Design a protein around this ligand. Sequence first.
Ligand SMILES: [Mg+2]
Ligand SMILES: [Mg+2]
Ligand SMILES: [Mg+2]
Ligand SMILES: [Zn+2]
Ligand SMILES: [Zn+2]
Ligand SMILES: [Zn+2]
Length: 143
Amino acid sequence: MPKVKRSRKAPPDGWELIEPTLDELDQKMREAETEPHEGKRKVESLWPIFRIHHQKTRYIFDLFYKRKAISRELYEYCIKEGYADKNLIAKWKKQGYENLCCLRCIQTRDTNFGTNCICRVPKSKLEVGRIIECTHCGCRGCS
RNA sequence: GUGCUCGCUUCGGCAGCACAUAUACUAAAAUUGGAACGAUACAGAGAAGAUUAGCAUGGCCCCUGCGCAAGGAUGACACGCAAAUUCGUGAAGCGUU
Ligand SMILES: [Mg+2]
Ligand SMILES: [Mg+2]
Ligand SMILES: [Mg+2]
Ligand SMILES: [Zn+2]
Ligand SMILES: [Zn+2]
Ligand SMILES: [Zn+2]
C-alpha cells in the first residue's frame, strides 16, 4: 500500500508528522498515472505529472527552508526516497528561478532555437495580456 | 516571483533597483487520396515429337533475403504479317512528236 522504501533503516525523527500529506500527495500521483486520455491532447496528458511532482518537492522545500520544521537528516531522507527532487530545489534556490515548473522549461537543448520556454518570460515583458500554456509543462508564467 | 533599498515609512499600499526574457511538425481534429489478404468466375507454366536440369541477357517489372550469396516457373516479360537510304533489262502490243 505505501511506497516501498529502499533504505530499510527506519526513517528519521520527524517523519510521522509529514507522512499523511506525503502519502496523500503520493495517492494523488497514482491518480494521474492512471487517467485515460480521451479529451486530453497528446502533450496535455503528461501535464499533471509535472504539477504533482512540483507540489511534492515544494512541500519538503517549504518545511526545510521556510518553516525550518525538518532537520537535514529527514530532509535528505525525502530526497533519497524520491519524495523531493534534488535538482528542482537547487534551481529554486537561485535568484530569478524561484517558481520554476520543470527542469524541461529551462533546458535549452529541448527547443528549436536554443532558448527557454515562454513559460519563463516575465508576464510584464509580454505586454499584451496573451494567455500562455507551456507545452512541456502546462505552466502559465513561472517568472 | 523573490530580494535589497539607512524609499516614502507602516508593517497596509506604493516607488526605485537587481535577478529572471519568447514553448509549440502549433489538434483532444476536420479533411484528402491510395491501399488487406483473399475470396469471386477466367486462367496454366520455356527450348522446333514427348518428358524435362538449368545459367544468363535488357529494363518506366517487381517479391524474399543483411547480402556484391541464393531463391522466386530457367521469377515474370521478350514470340516480332521481323521491309532503313536507293534501281534497271529485253522483246511484244497500242497511241503519240
Ligand atoms: Mg535465379
Ligand atoms: Mg524447370
Ligand atoms: Mg532469370
Ligand atoms: Zn514547466
Ligand atoms: Zn515552460
Ligand atoms: Zn512555468
